[PDB]
Amino acid sequence: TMSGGFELQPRDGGPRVALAPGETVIGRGPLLGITDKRVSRRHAILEVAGGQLRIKPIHTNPCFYQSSEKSQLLPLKPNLWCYLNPGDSFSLLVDKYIFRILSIP
């Protein structure tokens, strides 16, 4: 699909992953390059719409969020959306598969 204006930057280093407009299911699989029994194939939904990115955790294993100014990944309340502003981070495990949000054209 087309550019959605956001990219995910792995905090451990490596290629950025571009997001398209609309909903993208994330978890294990080729999109993020994750092969790991600890991460569901249906771990979270990212949605790009109206110039914003939000995440909804959809599995029993949580997602985590760190606002750009803060220092700690916090587990998100399940099955509710959280906006991810550019510079914020989220992760699929508490200390692994962490991504910073970047805004692009």
Report yes or no: 42 and 25 within 8 Å, Cβ to Cβ: yes
Query: What range defines the domain where residue 104 resides?
Result: 5-105
Instruction: Determine the residue type at 38.
Output: R
25/103 Cα distance (integer angstroms): 19
Report yes or no: 105 and 5 within 8 Å, Cβ to Cβ: yes
Report yes or no: 55 and 84 within 8 Å, Cβ to Cβ: yes
Q: What is the 3-state secondary structure (H, E, C) of 53-78?
A: EEEEECCCCCCEEECCCCCCCEECCC
Resolution in A: 1.3
- The number of distinct structural domains making up the chain is 1
Report yes or no: 7 and 19 within 8 Å, Cβ to Cβ: yes
* Alpha helix segments (H runs only) across 1-105: none
- Positive or negative, the CA dihedral 40, 50, 10, 73 is negative
20 token code pair: 């398209």
Question: What CATH code is carried by the domain that includes residue 61?
Answer: 2.60.200.20
